[PDB]
Amino acid sequence: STEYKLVVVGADGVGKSALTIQLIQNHFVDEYDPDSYRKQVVIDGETCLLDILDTAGQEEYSAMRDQYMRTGEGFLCVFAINNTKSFEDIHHYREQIKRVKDSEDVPMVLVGNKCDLPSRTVDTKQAQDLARSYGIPFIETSAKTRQGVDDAFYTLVREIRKHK
Ligand SMILES: Nc1nc2c(ncn2[C@@H]2O[C@H](COP(=O)(O)OP(=O)(O)O)[C@@H](O)[C@H]2O)c(=O)[nH]1
């Protein structure tokens, strides 16, 4: 079966690592010290291997971040629903991915994480309008309750499958 390399990007603290660890290990972590992990899953009846590359801890413009992005086939662009700044930063990460892959057509999913937390500052309509402007899906997640987590990563695999 095919292996899919998925890279998780977003501002520090939005939950890249907690999402990754929930996907792989089925546990929520209160802290993560920065990173790649593999797991076999079945998506739409089709077995595949996920290789998740977590950019947590990499400096904003590091050579290793660029290598991670070059290696990736699809990207999760994560913000936190309780952090307007991290939502405003999404364009930065999208631009970086486009530069590194040297393409305007890169499989991506927009992920609004921490949807369990009370203090929402980003509406689902704002996020869906950004996603719509990029032509990509939007998925709301909580690494803590597991809502949306599988759906985010699996939707990204579906996007890659549509790209090849
Ligand atoms: N309540 C809640 N906390 C989260 C969620 N995702 C991550 N966290 C927490 O937010 C902090 C940052 O998460 P981390 O995964 O290290 O963020 P990263 O820097 O983007 O990798 C930690 O204290 C995590 O427990 C979530 O969906 N809900």
Curated annotation (Swiss-Prot):
InterPro entries named among the record's database cross-references: P-loop_NTPase, Small_GTP-bd, Small_GTPase, Small_GTPase_Ras-type
Which EC number(s) are documented for this chain? 3.6.5.2
What membrane topology does the annotation report for this chain?
Lipid-anchor
Q: Which residues carry this modification: N6-acetyllysine?
A: 101
> Where is motif Effector region found?
32-37
Per the record, its GO cellular-component terms are: cytoplasm; cytoplasmic side of plasma membrane; cytosol; endoplasmic reticulum membrane; focal adhesion; Golgi membrane; membrane; mitochondrial outer membrane
What reaction does this enzyme carry out catalytically?
GTP + H2O = GDP + phosphate + H(+)
| UniProt entry keywords in alphabetical sequence | Acetylation, Cardiomyopathy, Cell membrane, Cytoplasm, Deafness, Disease variant, Ectodermal dysplasia, Glycoprotein, GTP-binding, Hydrolase, Intellectual disability, Isopeptide bond, Lipoprotein, Membrane, Methylation, Nucleotide-binding, Palmitate, Prenylation, Proto-oncogene, Ubl conjugation
Q: Where is the secretion signal located?
A: none
The impact of changing residue 143 to T is: In OES; somatic mutation; also found in colorectal cancer samples
Q: Which PANTHER family match?
A: RAS, DI-RAS, AND RHEB FAMILY MEMBERS OF SMALL GTPASE SUPERFAMILY (PTHR24070)
Function summary: Ras proteins bind GDP/GTP and possess intrinsic GTPase activity. Plays an important role in the regulation of cell proliferation. Plays a role in promoting oncogenic events by inducing transcriptional silencing of tumor suppressor genes (TSGs) in colorectal cancer (CRC) cells in a ZNF304-dependent manner.
This protein is called GTPase KRas
What is the organism of origin for this protein?
Homo sapiens
